[PDB]
């Protein structure tokens, strides 16, 4: 309804223009409108959806971390009392972040995931579901933290099971999924050993499949493999 009166193709065209203009809130709203047309998304369209919300929530996460750090310093020995403002503003940013995560999860649940029959689309969306519950987990502190974490884990696990059965080890979505599930284990689930094991196995199995690939696919796969190595270098 926000975008209910615009053509699907026009929303896609404008999402690509907004990306070019680095207008990612606009990008996300256009792609939300496209999803709400009710048709499945093509591969390029799923990419646009992911890029848009990655950038929106990425700016919110960076701001939340800045403010959380300030708030934590305010609660140390020797820190003068500055009043409620830092907590209030952190909460404001946190609430808007949670709203963005909720919006993406709503799109996945109504009805992207249930209509996604192909391995590539179903794994793509389940990875997103894991990612956006992970972002909720990064800020969760109350009664529902454990359920939020388990919701991320469950989405990632279903995606991993499908990707293992249905996609080659070098597939970029399979690799980015494994990368992010490994980050979940390290940063969210207090399971650094699992994170390291997953990253290593993922890297080694892709290495052994590179020989099957074209020059262009090899470039795509080795790019994500380097992020696995970067994490392993950080974590070990």
């Amino acid at each position: 309804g926000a975008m209910g009166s615009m053509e699907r193709a026009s929303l896609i065209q404008k999402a690509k223009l907004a990306e070019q203009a680095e207008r990612y809130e606009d990008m996300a709203a256009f792609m939300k409108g496209a999803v709400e047309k009710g048709e499945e998304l093509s591969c390029e369209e799923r990419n646009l959806l992911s890029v848009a919300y990655k950038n929106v929530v990425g700016g919110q996460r960076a701001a939340w971390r800045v403010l959380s750090s300030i708030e934590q310093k305010s609660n140390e020995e020797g820190s003068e009392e500055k009043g409620p403002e830092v907590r209030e503003y952190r909460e404001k940013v946190e609430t808007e972040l949670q709203g963005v995560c909720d919006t993406v999860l709503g799109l996945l649940d109504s009805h992207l995931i249930k209509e996604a029959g192909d391995a590539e689309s179903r794994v793509f969306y389940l990875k997103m579901k894991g990612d956006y519950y992970r972002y909720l987990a990064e800020v969760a502190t109350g009664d529902d933290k454990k359920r939020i974490i388990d919701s991320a884990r469950s989405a990632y696990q279903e995606a991993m099971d499908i990707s293992k059965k249905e996609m080659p080890p070098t597939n970029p979505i399979r690799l980015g999924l494994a990368l992010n599930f490994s980050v979940f284990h390290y940063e969210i689930a207090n399971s650094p050993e699992e994170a390291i094991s997953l990253a290593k196995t993922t890297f080694d199995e892709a290495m052994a499949d590179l020989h099957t690939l074209s020059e262009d696919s090899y470039k795509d796969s080795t790019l994500i493999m380097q992020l696995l190595r970067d994490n392993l270098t950080l974590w070990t």
């Binding site: 992911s50 992010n180 992020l227």
Partner: peptide
């Protein structure tokens, strides 16, 4: 390092 952008 996570990875949310394909090509």
């Amino acid at each position: 390092x996570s990875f949310x952008x394909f090509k």
